[PDB]
Design a protein around this ligand. Sequence first.
Ligand SMILES: [Zn+2]
Length: 29
Amino acid sequence: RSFVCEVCTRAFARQEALKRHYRSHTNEK
Ligand SMILES: [Zn+2]
């Protein structure tokens, strides 16, 4: 397992870093 962005694939060591990332795939300059 791992914290990878299914959208793009960007992996993050910190989950929060991911969730926050996924926000960019929606609305988060
Ligand atoms: Zn992504």
